[model samples]
Target chain A: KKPKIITIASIKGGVGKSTSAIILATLLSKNNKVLLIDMDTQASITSYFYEKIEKLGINFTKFNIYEILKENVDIDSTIINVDNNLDLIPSYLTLHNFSEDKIEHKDFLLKTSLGTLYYKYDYIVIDTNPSLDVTLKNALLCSDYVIIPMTAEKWAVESLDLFNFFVRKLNLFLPIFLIITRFKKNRTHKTLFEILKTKDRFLGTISEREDLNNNFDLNKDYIKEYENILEIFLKKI
Target chain B: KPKIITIASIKGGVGKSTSAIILATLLSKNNKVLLIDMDTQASITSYFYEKIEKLGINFTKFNIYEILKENVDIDSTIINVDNNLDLIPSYLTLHNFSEDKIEHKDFLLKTSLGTLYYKYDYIVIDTNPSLDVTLKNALLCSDYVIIPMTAEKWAVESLDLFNFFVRKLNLFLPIFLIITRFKKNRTHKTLFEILKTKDRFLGTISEREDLNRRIAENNNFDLNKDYIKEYENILEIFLKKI
Candidate 1:
C-alpha cells in the first residue's frame, strides 16, 4: 500500500519540530518504505541522521532538493537510498535564498517534482520549517495530513489558536493534529491540553525524555526501544 | 519579624517595576522600610521611588554602589520618603550593560544589602529586569520572595525557573506567588496547582486597575485598602509582624 504523506509543521521555533519528524520517520520505517524530506534551514534532522556532509557521498551534491526545485534537476538524482526501505531527500542552506523571492507556481512544485516516486514509497514524511512560510504552505497543500508539533511553553499554547486560524484561512483539505512534544509534567501543559481538547483538534502528547537524542547517533528508533511511544504514534495515525 | 519584599521580574514588559514601588509604599507606612533598587535601568528606584520629579516626599538617594563600596554615608543616604520608609537607588541603566559587571559586584552588593537591613523593620528589594544581577543579589539578601507574574503563556514555567534558581542556591526565602493582570485562570487553576508545590510560593493577586494606579502615581501604599487587600493577604501568610 502506498503511504500517506505527512507534513509536520510548527509555526514557531523550539517546539520539538525536528524531533517529531525524526521520530515519525523512524516509527513508520519499521513496516513500510519511508521517504524523509528535511525542509528546515537548520537541517537539524539531516545532521542528526547523517553527521558528516562528506559521508553522504557525491549523490548528495548531484540531486539535492534545492537543485531539483531551482535548477529543475531530476528528483531521482538527489534521492539517497537510506537502507533497503528508506530514502532521503536532504536539505541545503541554498533553500533559504530560493525562499527570498516568491516561486511563481509555488503550490505544485514539490508535488510535481516527486509525484513520480509516489508508487515507490509507502510513507513520505516531510519535516517543515518552523514558520508559516510559503514553502510550508505549499507542503501543507500537497500533504494528506499536517501534524503540529508544540512544546510545553505558554507561547506554544497561544500558537495553536493562530495555527488553527491559518488552517481556516488557507482552506486546505488535510486533517490536522496538535501533537505536544517535550512535555514536562507541569501545570501549563495540563491547562493548555484541557483547553486544546475542547477545540477537538488535539492528537496526543509526547512525554519528556533525554533518550530521544541519546539514540540518534546509532540510527536507532527510540519508539522501538520504548514501546509506549510507538503505540502513541500508531494510535494517533 | 517584618516581611521581606523581593521584586520578581522577567525581561518581558509585564509589571515588575510597578509591583516593586507599590509593595515598597504599602510596607513603608509604619515600619522602618528599606527599598533596594537592583535593576540596571533603576527606573523603579530613580523615576518612581527616588526621583523628585513628582514633587512628592524626597526619599534617600543612595545608589547601589554604596552597598559595595566603603560608604559610611549609606545610613545618611537612606532618604526618608515618609517618616518610616527609606530608599537606596541604583545608578543608570548603562552601569549593568554586560554580565561581567554583575559578576564582579555580586558578592559586594549581596553582603552590603544583607547587613544593613538587620536594623530595618521591613526590607523591600527591587530587582533587575532579568533573573541575572538584581534578582541574584535580591534573592541572596532576602528573607522572603514574592513572584509577581502576569498570567501569560509560559509565565508559570518562568516562575518555576525563578523558584528553581532559589532552590539551587540553597536560599530558604519563603515565596509569595501573586498572579497579576489576569481576568480569569485561562490556564486553569488545576494547572496552577500542578505547578505549585507544597515547599514554596503563595496565592494570586486580584486583577485590579487600582493596583496599577497605585504604582503609577507612587502614592497609595497601605495593603488594608480595597485594591491592596489581596497583596496584604499574601504578605500576611509569611509576615506575622504585619
Candidate 2:
C-alpha cells in the first residue's frame, strides 16, 4: 500500500518547515516505509542526515536526488537507508542553484519528478523552501496534503491571506491545514490564535518543547519518543 | 451665545483632561466660562476643580445635568478657577460605577448639563477616556469638538476608525484636530496627512511653545505667550470657523 504524501510549506521563513518534515516522516515511518525528500537549496534537512556532506564528503555522492530527478541517476543509486524502513533523498548546494534555475513552471517539475517515485515508497514527505517558488508550487500541487506551520507574528497572519489568495487562484483540490508551531505563551500568540479561530483557519498547535533539538539525528525518530503527545496530531490530520 | 466646546478623543492618555483644563482656563480668563464634565470617571471634573478647590481656584461646578435639564443654575455654583471661568463637576472616580449601572437611564447627564449651560458665555466640556456613553453624550451636546492624539504606529489607522465611527453616529457635527506632544522626527508627515484625509478630520494644530507649557504644567485653559503666535491661526479658526 502506498503511504499518503504530505508536504510542509509556508512562504515565511523561520516557520519550522524542516522540523515538521523530520517529525512527520519519523512518526509515519514507525508503521510504514517512509522516504523523506529535502527539496530546499539550503539543504537544511539534508544536513541533519549527513553532517559531513558539507566538507565535500562522498556520503551522498551517489545518493543525490537531484541527479535522480533529472534521470541521470536511478532510485537505488540515490536512496539512503536511514533505518529498517526509513529512507532519505538528500539535496546538495549544487541542487539549490539548479532549483533556482529550473523552477520557472512552478508546479510541473515536482509533479513530473515525484511521479517516478510514486510506487517506490509508502510515504514521501517533502521539506520545501519558504517562498512561492516553483519548487513550493510543485510540492503543493503534487502532495495529497500540505501543512502550513507558522509562528506568532502579524506578518504571519498577513501571509495566510496571501496563501488563501494564491490557493484560490490555483484552484487546486489538495487540502491545506494551518499548523501553528513553536507557540509560546504570550498575548500575541493568544491574540493570533483567537483571530485565526474567528477566521476559521486554525487546525492545531504544537506544544513548546525544549527537547526537540535533541531529536534531529538522521536515523532517530522523535515521534517514537513523543508519540503519546503527538497522537493528537495523528487524529487531527 | 457661548461656544459649546468638547474635548473628544478615542485614544487613552493623550492628555485630553489636561488640554481641556488649560484650554478652558484660557477661555475663561477673558469670557464668562462654564466647564462641564461629561466623563464617567468624573476625574477631570473632580481632580482639577473639585478635589483641588482648597488650592484656591474658584470655578462653577456642575455635572451633566445642567445640560440635560435645561434649568439648573448656570452661574452661581460656578467655582472661580481663575478670573471668569466656572466648572460643573461630576462624581470623582465615577466611571466604573456607571458601567452597566446606568444603562437604563439614558441621557440624564447630557440633557441636564446642556440645558443648564444654555446661557453661559462658553461651555468647555471634557469627555470620558473611551468612546462609550458619556463621550457619545458629550459629542451629541457639543457645538464644536477638538480631538487630541499621539502619533504612534497604527495612530493613523486609529484615526480612520474614529472618523468612520463618528460619521456613522452623526455626520454634521463640527470637529477640530490636534496632535499633542508632537515630535517631528518620530512620525511621517505623509502618514499624518493620509490619516487626516482618510478620517475626514482636520490637522492644523501647530507644535508650539504654548502647547509645551500646557503639557508641562498639566494646565488646560491657557496657551503660553510664545506658543500664542503659532496657535493664533488655530485659535482664529476655533473662534470663527464653527
Candidate 3:
C-alpha cells in the first residue's frame, strides 16, 4: 500500500507547528512505520531530535534536507533511522536557500523526491515553516493531508483564514484538520470554539498542560495528551 | 517623480520594519515597487525570505552591502518579488557594514540604487533603526521618507534629532510621519495629540496585533481583507498627501 504523507502547516508563528509535528510523529510511530521530515529553516525539530538521538548513543548519518535538495546529495544517504519504526530527514538553515535554487519544477520538488520512498513507510510526516514560500508550496504538493495546529489565542481566526485561503488557492483538495493547541475554555475561547466548530473538520483540542509548556522533558508524561489527539487523527486517516 | 522612500527610526522595534513591509507590499499592488533592507537585524529580509528566494536565480549570496559597496550589480541582488515588487535582501553578513568605514559610506545606498530611480515608481528602504551612514545613504536618495515613531519620549526626541539632522544636511525631502503601535494610554494620548500637529503627519497605525504579522511577499492581501482595508484607507490618504 502507498504511504500516507502529512504536513503540519500554519502561517502563524509560535503556534506549535513544530511541536505538533513532533507529538503527532511520535504518536504515529508507536503503531506504524513512520518517516519524519523536518523542513523548517528554524531547525527546531532538528535541534531537539539531534540532542535526543545523540544521548541515546545512536550512530546516525547526518545528511540534512539541504544537502539532499540543494547540494545534490543522495536522498537515501540522508535518511537517518530515528527509532525502531521511525526514519528521519533533518533540516538546516541552508534549506531556506532552496527558495532561490533553480530547478525544473519547484512545486514538485518534494513530491518527486518522496515518490521513491513511499513503499517503505506507513506514514510520512512533514513539518514546515510558517511562510507562503516556494518551499511551503512544495510541501503542500507532496502531502495528501495537512494538519494545521493553531493557538486558541490572539489573531487565531486571522491565521486560520490566511492558511485556509492559501490551501484553497493551491487548488489541492487536501483534507485539512484543524486542531487547537493550548486550548483553555475562556470567554474568548468559547466564542472562538463556536466559530471554529462550524467547520465540520475541526478535531478535538489539546488542553494546555504545565509540563507541555514549562518543562518539555521527553521522558516525562508530557505526551499523554498527544496520545488522545493522535487517536482522533488516526480515525480520519 | 519617482519616490525613493526610506522608513527610519533611531530605536529598534518601533514599527519601521512592519510599516515598511505593509506600506511597500500595499504600494506594489498598483506600482513597480523596490524595497531595500538596510537593517542589520534583517527583520524585513526574514519577513520576505521565502518569497525573495522563489526567483531561484539569486544564488550570488550578495547582501545589500555588496550592492551598495559596488561589489555586485543592482539587478543581481535585486529579488524580483512578484514582478511588481523587487527586494534587495539582507543577511547576517550585512551586519558587518554597520561596523563602519569612511567617506563614501553615506552615499553608497543612494548611488548604488541611482540607476533604478527611473525604473521604479516607489523604492522603499528599511534601515537598521540607527540614524547612521546606512540610514543617511537611504535618506539621501529619497523623494519621500517615512518616519515611524512610537509614543515614547525617546521617539519624540529622536524625531527632533531626525529633522535637525535632515535640516543640517539640507536633504529638503518630504518626511512624512506615521505614529505606529498607538495605544490609548494617558501618556500616549498626549504624545499622539502633539505629533498629529506635524505639517506632514500621515496619521496613525493602530496597535492591532493582527496587522503586524504575515506580510505578503506574493499577493494574498485579499485573504487579509479586513487588515488590508485598514492599511488601504491609510494608503489612500497617503497617495493624496504625496
Candidate 4:
C-alpha cells in the first residue's frame, strides 16, 4: 500500500509542531513502517535524530534533504534507519537557500521524490518550518493530510485564517486537523477550546506534560494520547 | 537619570509585552518609569488605552514613528498613563522605520533617548519578535536586556542566535533570561537545566489561570499580588546586578 503522507505545520513558531511530528511518527511506527522528514531550516528534528544515530553507531554519507532536492541525489542513500520500523530524511542549514527557481518543478519536488518509496513504508510524516515560503508550500502540495499544532494564544488563533487561506489557494482538498498543544486547564484555554471545537476538523488535545520534552523515550500516557489521535485520524482520512 | 532596559526575544508570544507592562508598573511605584513600545504590533501602546487609529495624528505628527523619523522632541510623544508611569506609544507605521536608509540608524533610538536621560528613573522597552533593524536599534539603546522565553527546546536554542547577534554588535549589556508560562513538566525541567548552563536565568513564572484570564480580556487592571512579587524579585536582582 502507498504510505499516507502527513505534514505537521504551523505558522507560529515554538508551538510544538516539530515535537508533534516526531511523536506521531514514533507512535505510528510501533506496528507500521514510518518515515520522518525534517523540512525546517532550524534542523531541530534532524539534530534530534543525529544524536540518536551517533549513539547507535549508524553511519551515513549523505544525511541532509538539501542534497536530495538540489542535486537530485538518490533518495535511498539519504534514508537513515532510525529504529526497528522507522526511517528519517534529515535536514541541514543550507535548506534556507532552497529557491523555487533552482528546480524545474519546485512544488512537485517533494512529491516526486517520495514516489519511489511509495510502498516501502506505511506512513511518511513531515515537519515544516514556521515561514510561508517555498518549503512550506511544497510540503502542503505533497501531503495527504496536515496537522496544525497551536496554543490558545491570540497569535495562534490569528494564524488559523492565514493557514486556511493558503490551503484554499493551493486547492489541496486534504484533511487538515487542528491539535491543541500545551493546553492548560485555565479559563483562557477552556474558552478557546470550546470555540475551536466548533470546527469540523478539530482533533483531540494534548496537555502540557513534562515528560514529553526532548527525551525520545515514549511514556505510556503519551502513547495512549497519540493512539487516540491516530484513531480519529484513521476514521476521518 | 534613568537606566534603559529592553525586554527582547527572537521567539514571539512569550509574554514580552506582559513582562514589560508589569515591570514598568512595578518600577513606577518607587520611581518615574517610561515604557517605550517598539513592537509594530503596538501591544504595549494599546495596553495603556491609546488606540493606534484614534491618535488623530499623521505619520510624522505624533508617537514614536515620528519621533524616530522626523527627529521630534522626545517629550512631545510621551503620554502620561498614571502617577509615575509614562509611555511613548508606537503604531503599525513604526515598522516602516526598519527600511529607512538613514545615517546612524542603529544609534538613532539610543541617541534620542539620551536627550531625556535625567528625567526618569528607569526606561523599559518592549521589542518585536524578529531580530530585524528595529530589534537591533532596541538592543543598541538598552543597558540591559531581559529575554522572556518559554521552557521549550527550540526557545532555549534560539538564544544562541540572540547571543551571537549581541556579540557581533560588541555591546557589553547584561542579558538575563526569565522563563514564562513555565509548567512543572519533565520537558521543562530538562530544557531549563540546559538553559541554566548558558546564561544568567532570573526565575520562572509558572502558568497561572488568573494572569492568563486577565491578559485574555485585555484587562491590565490589577494582577495577582503574587505576579507582582515575581516581577519585584526579578527587578531587585536586576538592580543588584547593575
Candidate 5:
C-alpha cells in the first residue's frame, strides 16, 4: 500500500516545522511503518539522526536524498533505518544544488522517485525548507497533506498569503492544516491564535520548549499542551 | 560610487532583514545609504509602511521589482525614509519574477543596479532567503556579502551550502559572517567556536525577545544601549576590515 504523505512546511523559519515533523513521524511509527524524508538542505533532521547513529557506532550507506534525486537510484538503496518501524531519506548540503532550471519535470522528481516504495511503509512525512525552492516543490508535489507552522509575527498573514499563492499556483490544492509553534503568552500570541482559529483549518499550537531546541532526543514528551493537538492531528491523519 | 553590500542567507529567519535595516540605518547616520529589499516577503519594506501610507503615495507601484522587471527609473522607486537613508522596497508580486525564463535573468540586476553606482556612499541589498534566480541576480551585482547567521548546525549547513552555491557560479566576493540571535547554550557556544575558527566572523548579536516584536518605522527604531553597543562593535569591525 502507498504511504500517506504528510509535509510540514512554512516559508518562515524557526517556526518548529522540523520539530513538528519529527514528533508526528515518531509517534506515527509506534503502531505503523513510517518513513521521514528530510528534503531541506539545511539537514536539521539528518544531523539529528546522524549524531544518534554515530553514538550507536553503526555504519550505513553514505548516499542521501541529493544523490537519489539526481541519479534516480532505487529509494531502497538510500533508506536509513532510524528506529523501530521508522526509516529516513537523509539530505545534505549538496541537495541545495537541485534547481528548477536543470531538472526536467522538476515538480515530480520526488513523486516519481518514490514510486518503487509502494507497499513499503504506512506513512511518509516530509520536512521542507523555508525557501520555495525546487526541493520544496518536489516535496509538495507528492504530499497528501500539508501542515503550515507559523509564529506570532505580524507578517505571518502576508507570508502565509504568499505560501497559499504558491500552493494554488502549483495546481495542487492539498489538504492544508495550520499550527502555531514556539508560542508564549502575550497579545501577539493570543491575537494570532484567535485569527488562525477563524480559518477552521487551524489544528493547535505547540509551546516554546528549550528541550526541543537544545536536545536531540527522538521520542519524548512535547510540551504538555501538545497532547490534545496530537489527537487532533491524528484524527485528521 | 557606492560600494554595494548584500545581506544574504539561503536559510530564512536568520536575522537577514533586521541586520540589513540596522546596517543601513547605522551607515546612513553619517553617509548616504540606500537599502534595497529584494525579498518578496517584504519585511523591510513593511517596516516603513506607516510613513509611506501617510504620504498618500502608491508605494507598491515603485519598488525593486519595478526596477528589475519593468525597467522603471531607479530613482522613482527610491524613498527618502530618513535624513540620510533611502530605500527601494519589495512586494509579494516580486516572487513571480523568480520564475522568468530569460537566459540572462540571473544577471538582470547587474545592469540595473549598476546604473546607481554614483548615487550613494553605500548600497545595502537584502535578498530573499532562497536559492533562486532573484538571489543569483543580487549576488552577481554585489561587492561584499554579509551573512547574518545563527550559530547552529542548520546555520552551518546553510552557510556551507551558500558558499557552494556561490562557488558553483565562479563568483568570488568578500564574505563576512556575523552570528545573530546568539544564545547561551552549550551547543550554541560550541558551534560558535567552530564558526569563529572559520576566521570570517564579524561579531555576535544576542537573542533578545524584544527584537522579535521590533520593526523599523520611518527607516529607524529605538535600540537599547546593549544592542546599540553590539551593533556599533559590528560596525567598527566591519569598517576596519573593509
Candidate 6:
C-alpha cells in the first residue's frame, strides 16, 4: 500500500508550519513509519536538527533535498533517521537557487522522486516554503492532503483567500485543512478564531503555550497536543 | 541633527514592533523622538491607537504610504502620539508599490527623511520582517540598526542573514542585538549563550505578562523596576557605540 502524503504549508511565514510538521511527524512516527521532508529554502527544519547535532559534537550524514532534485541523487540514501521510526530528508540554502524554468517537468519532480519509495513508509509529511512559488505548487500537486497552519493575525486570515485562489487556479481536489496555531485568549484572537471556525475544513485548535512553542527537545506535553491533532486528522482522512 | 535608528529582523513575531514602541517611548522621555512605521501590517501604527481599517483617514493625505509614493509632505504625515514622541503611521496600501518603482527610487526614504533630520533628537524606524526594498530603504536611512530576536534556535540562526544583508549594503553603521521575549529555559539558555559570543549583544528582555498586557492596553510599561534597568543598560551600551 502507498503511504499517505501530507504537506504542511502556509502563505505567511513564522506561522508555525515547520513546527507543526515536526510535531505531527514525531507523534505519528511512534506507531508508523514516517518521513518528514523539509522543502523550504530557509532550511529551518534541517537547521533545527543539525544545530542539536552540532551541539552534541556528533558526526552525522548531511543529505539534503537539493541534491535529490538538482543532482538526481538517490532519495532513499538521503533519508536520515532523526528519531524512532521518524526519518527526514533535509533541505539546504542552495534550494534558494531552484528555478522552475531550469528543471524539466518541475511540478512532477517531487512527486516522481517520492513515488519510488511510497511503500516504505506509512506516512510522509512535507514542510513547504512560505510562498506560493513553484516549489509550493509541486508540493500541493504531490500531496494527498495539505494542512495550513495559521495564526490569529489579520494578515494570516487574509492569506486564506489567496491560498483558496491558488488551489482553484491549479484545479487541485485534495483535502485542505486549516489548523489554528499560536492562539491566544485575547479579543483579536478570539474574534478571528470564531470567524475561522465556520470553515468546513477546520481541523482543530492549538493554544499558544510555551511548552508547545518551545518544543525543541521533543517535549512530551507538546507531542500530546499533536497526538490529539493526529487522532482528529486520521478520523477525517 | 538627530540620528536615525531602525529595528529590523527577518523573522516575524520576534517583538520588532513592540521593541520599537518601547524604545521610542523610552527615548522620548528626554529626547524628541519620531517612530516611523514601515510595515504594511501597520502593527506599530496600531500600537498608537490608529487602526488602518477604522481610521477612515485619507491614506494619500498624510500616511507613510503616501509619503513613500511622493504624494504628500512628510510634515503633514507626522502625528504627535505623546509628549516628545511623534509617529508616521503606515497603511496596507503601502505594499502595493511595484518592484520597479521601489528599485528605481531605492533612496527615496533616506532622501525624504533628510528633509526633517534636524527637527528631532532621535528617529526610530520599525521595519517589516521580510528582506525587501522597504527594509533596504530603512537600512539606507539608518545611522544604526538594532536587531531584536527571541531566544529560539531559528531566531538565533536568522541573525546571520541580517548580518549578511547589512554587509552587502556596505553601510558602516553600528549594529546591536537585543534579545526579547526571553524565558529561562534550557533551549533559551543554550541559544542565549551562543548569541553572547557574538558582538554587540546588548541585553535580554524578560518575557513578562505585564509588559505584553501594557503594550496591548497602550499604556506605559510598569517598568517592573528590573525591566527598566535592563532597558537602561542596553541604552547605555547603545549610546557608547554611537
True contacts kept of each: 0.00, 0.00, 0.00, 0.00, 0.15, 0.00
- State each model's CA lDDT, in order: 0.62, 0.61, 0.71, 0.76, 0.78, 0.76
lDDT of prediction 3: 0.71
* Per-structure clash totals for the candidates: 7, 48, 2, 3, 1, 0
Best by lDDT: 5
Task: Using TM-score, give the best candidate's number.
Answer: 5
Give residue A25's lDDT in candidate 3 (0 to 100).
81
For model 5 chain A, give the 10-residue run with minimal summed lDDT: A214-223
- Indicate the DockQ of the complex predicted as candidate 1: 0.02
Inter-residue clash pairs, candidate 3: A99-B53, A100-B56
The sequence of per-residue lDDT tens digits that candidate 2 reaches over residues A16-70 is 7788887778777878888888877556677676643445454564567566555
Clashing pairs in 4: A210-B185, A210-B186, A210-B187
lDDT of 3 by residue, A1-237 (tens): 778889898765556788888778877777888898888766667766775566765433247787666537667777767666878888754564465456777677677777654348889899886665566787898788988987665457866666666678788888988887777868866777787777867776777776672224474444766777677777866
Error of 6 at B212 (Å): 4.7
| Candidate 2 Cα misplacement greater than 4 A, ranges | A51-62, A99-106, A197-201, A213-233, B1-242
User: Per-residue alpha-carbon lDDT of model 4 for A87-164, expressed as tens digits?
Assistant: 888875446446323567787778778776534888999998775556777898888899999889754565777677
Local accuracy of candidate 4 as per-residue lDDT tens digits, B64-147: 877778567877788777779888887555645654669987887887877763488888998876656677788997888999
Arranged by lDDT with the best first, the candidates are 5, 4, 6, 3, 1, 2
User: Candidate 2, which CAPRI tier?
Assistant: incorrect
Residues A152-236 of candidate 1 have per-residue lDDT tens digits of 6534554666566666667876777777676667798888777666644576676666656424434444454334544654576
How far residue A58's Cα lies from its native spot in candidate 1, in Å, is 3.3
- Evaluated on CA atoms against the true complex, candidate 3 attains a DockQ of 0.02
Q: For residues A12-52, what per-residue lDDT tens digits would candidate 6 score against the true structure?
A: 66678998988888878879999989998666777777855
Q: What local lDDT does model 3 show for residue A81?
A: 75
lDDT of 5 by residue, A52-128 (tens): 65665543335678777876466777777777888888876667567634866877878888885644788889999
The numbered model that scores best in DockQ is 5
Taking every candidate in turn, the Cα RMSD to the unseen true structure, in Å, is 19.0, 20.2, 16.1, 7.9, 4.2, 5.5
Supply the TM-score for candidate 4: 0.58
User: What is the lDDT for B187 in model 2?
Assistant: 74
- Candidate 5 runs further than 4 Å off: A57-61, A152-161, A182-200, A207-227, A233-237, B11-15, B40-43, B46-61, B71-73, B114-118, B149-161, B170-172, B179-227
lDDT of 3 by residue, B74-155 (tens): 7767777664888888754453454445577778776776665338888888876444556677878887878877786435
